[PDB]
Design a protein around this ligand. Structure first.
Ligand SMILES: C[C@@H](O)[C@@H](C)Oc1nc(Nc2ccc([S@](=N)(=O)C3CC3)cc2)ncc1C(F)(F)F
Length: 284
């Protein structure tokens, strides 16, 4: 930490504060994450795992600094998060080819994490990072299980209904909501509490039953008393997404995590037949 000059705070989350910083020796510009708390021996090994987990679409973890009984993670710096890019692109929308590129690339990262049994668990526009060359990368995970107002908007229903051992399918759910948001320019499920989140999901997708989701009615926080809403058609939920986009989105948004599409199969969905890598117009 002596080795870095902080340039500016660029974020804050569950696990710490993030600064853009410069290596005082070598002039490298990095993102420096100070982990909020001795460090436990099992976060140390979980972090060692992450350092090896490298992929073009995963933010690179450069160095792990466990000194004076604090933890710092030194990451490559990316110049913009997708939340800011979405906000900046609100008048016209992000062009479809660019949405499709990003969704393709994020599935590719997720496919890689998931083959390694690593889950993100908290995907959101603020955790997705872009560059001037047209890449997008997932950031700020492995953190979730390594260590043990929060946004709920991208939370899978199994998590809101009290499932303790959830699967990679929670990340596909999240990425689904995000896809929809890029296309409509509105948040799909903008909840402000756990039950508001769950009921906004229930009014759009319909209240889940044993028919759409076997097991649902015995989950910890399921209540027979939940209201009964009817599902809406995706034609109403995500115009102007074409039928291929909607076909894919419905598969990412299946109630039953085991029916929900995997990242690897999503990469083969007909939606990505004509995928290309456009260059975004970034104002930095
Ligand atoms: C994942 C999450 O924590 C962001 C803050 O983290 C990271 N962020 C970046 N770059 C970054 C750059 C610009 C912006 S900005 N808000 O669009 C603009 C100043 C307003 C945001 C983030 N680079 C690496 C990381 C990471 F640490 F994850 F490696």
């Amino acid at each position: 930490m002596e080795n870095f000059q902080k340039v500016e705070k660029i974020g804050e989350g569950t696990y710490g504060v993030v600064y853009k910083a410069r290596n005082k020796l070598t002039g490298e510009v990095v993102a420096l994450k100070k982990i909020r708390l001795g460090v436990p021996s099992t976060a140390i090994r979980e972090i060692s795992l992450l350092k090896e987990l490298n992929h073009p679409n995963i933010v690179k973890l450069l160095d792990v600094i466990h000194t004076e009984n604090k933890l710092y993670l030194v990451f490559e710096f990316l110049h913009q998060d997708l939340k800011k890019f979405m906000d900046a692109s609100a008048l016209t929308g992000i062009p479809l080819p660019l949405i499709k590129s990003y969704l393709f690339q994020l599935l590719q990262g997720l496919a890689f994490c998931h083959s390694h049994r690593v889950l993100h668990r908290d995907l959101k526009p603020q955790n997705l990072l872009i560059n001037t060359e047209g890449a997008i990368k997932l950031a700020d995970f492995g953190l979730a299980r390594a260590f043990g107002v929060v946004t709920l908007w991208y939370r899978a229903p199994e998590i809101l209904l009290g499932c303790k051992y959830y699967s990679t399918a929670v990340d596909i759910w999240s990425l689904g909501c995000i896809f929809a948001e890029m296309v409509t320019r509105r948040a799909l499920f903008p909840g402000d509490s756990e039950i508001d989140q769950l009921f906004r999901i229930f009014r759009t997708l319909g209240t889940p039953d044993e028919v759409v989701w076997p097991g649902v009615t015995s989950m910890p926080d399921y209540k027979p008393s939940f209201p009964k809403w009817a599902r809406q058609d995706f034609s109403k939920v995500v115009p102007p997404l074409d039928e291929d986009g909607r076909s894919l989105l419905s598969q990412m948004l299946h109630y039953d995590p085991n029916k929900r599409i995997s990242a690897k199969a999503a990469l083969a969905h007909p939606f990505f037949q004509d995928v290309t890598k456009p260059v975004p117009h970034l104002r930095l």
